[PDB]
Amino acid sequence: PQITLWQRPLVTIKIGGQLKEALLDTGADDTVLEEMNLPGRWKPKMIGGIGGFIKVRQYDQILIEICGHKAIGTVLVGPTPVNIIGRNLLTQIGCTLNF
Amino acid sequence: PQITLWQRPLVTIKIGGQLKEALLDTGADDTVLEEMNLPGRWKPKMIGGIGGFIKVRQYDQILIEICGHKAIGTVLVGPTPVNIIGRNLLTQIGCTLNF
Ligand SMILES: COc1ccc(CN2C[C@H](O)[C@@](CCC(C)C)(c3ccc(S(C)(=O)=O)cc3O[C@@H](C)CO)C2=O)cc1
Numbered sequence: 140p141q142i143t144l145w146q147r148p149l150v151t152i153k154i155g156g157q158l159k160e161a162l163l164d165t166g167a168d169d170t171v172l173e174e175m176n177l178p179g180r181w182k183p184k185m186i187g188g189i190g191g192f193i194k195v196r197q198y199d200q201i202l203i204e205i206c207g208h209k210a211i212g213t214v215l216v217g218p219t220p221v222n223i224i225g226r227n228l229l230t231q232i233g234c235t236l237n238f
Numbered sequence: 239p240q241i242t243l244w245q246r247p248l249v250t251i252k253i254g255g256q257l258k259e260a261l262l263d264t265g266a267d268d269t270v271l272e273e274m275n276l277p278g279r280w281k282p283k284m285i286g287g288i289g290g291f292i293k294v295r296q297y298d299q300i301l302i303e304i305c306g307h308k309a310i311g312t313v314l315v316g317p318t319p320v321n322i323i324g325r326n327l328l329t330q331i332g333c334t335l336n337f
Contacts, residue, residue, distance in 0.1 A: 142335040144325040148264050163335055165247055166263030166322060171288070187319060188288025189270070208337065220287050223265060226243045234337040236241040236262055238307065238328075 140206070152224065153204040154214070159222050161205070165236060167225030170203075171195060171215040184215060193217055208232040239305070251323065252303035253313070258321055260304075264335060266324030269302075270314045276300055283314060292317055307331035 142148045148163040155177065169186060181196040195217030203210050205224055210231040241247045247262040254276055268285060280295040294316030301310050304323060309330035 140337065144264060144328045144333060144335075147267070147325070148335055162265050164263070164265030165243060165335070166261050166265045168246070186288065189266075189318065189322075190286045190291055191289030193288055206337075218288075226246070229243045229337075232337050234243055234335055236243070236247055236264070236333055237336050238239065238305075238331050238333040 150206040150224075152206070152222070154201070161222035161224050163229065163234070164223045164225055165229065167223050168227065169213065169215055169225045170223060170228045171217060171219045171225070172222045173216075173219055175216060177201060177214065177216060181216075186215065186217075188219075193219075195219075203228065205232050249305045249323070251305075251321070253300070260321035260323045262328060262333065263322045263324055264328065266322050267326070268314050268322075269311065269324045269327050270294060270316065270318040270322045272315075272318060272321055274315055276313060276315065280315075285314065285316075294318075302327060304331050 152161045177198045181198050184197040185192050195215040198214050201214040210228045251260045276297040280297050283296045284291045294314040297313050300313040309327045311326045
């Protein structure tokens, strides 16, 4: 699909069998979701947002469906204001910017 | 153009007689640039997200040239870690997400 930017580019994602709303974010290198339960082990990561840095939990090889497109990749979990789909997964679903 | 998301989508912008590098950010409501003076009146604003909030100066009806395309809108100036072109100007140059 083609998504315009007059409103926030919010889409439905599915992860762990549950639907969530998330922001398609070309400014985000990585994908970060609000506190939730994911399987396996995690590693520490620091990410820098508009306001400064925060600690998040990095989970690898996680199954996540984004607007119907299946991806498997790295998902970070931490105190984000909104669920964010970053470039690591936008590339998996074939997303580009066009004008 | 069609801009890949393999790397950060950085472009050259022209604003207030200066050439700068900026990030095309679909996750940003606003356009935020590093400290600089702009013409006209300004008012303080707080913007935030991951890391917390930062105080910026809001200038309205500012002309920017983004990758060849002229656009007019609100520009925020303050201690952003990177120059960001947000949705308020991305719409004006006809920028969309496509997959
Ligand atoms: C490494 O992986 C991640 C890094 C940061 C984030 C959180 N994000 C992504 C948004 O593109 C960004 C960009 C911040 C910029 C310095 C790289 C952002 C910019 C402007 C605005 S604004 C105030 O203009 O709307 C909001 C915004 O993100 C919020 C939605 C969440 O913080 C941010 O803070 C994620 C992953």
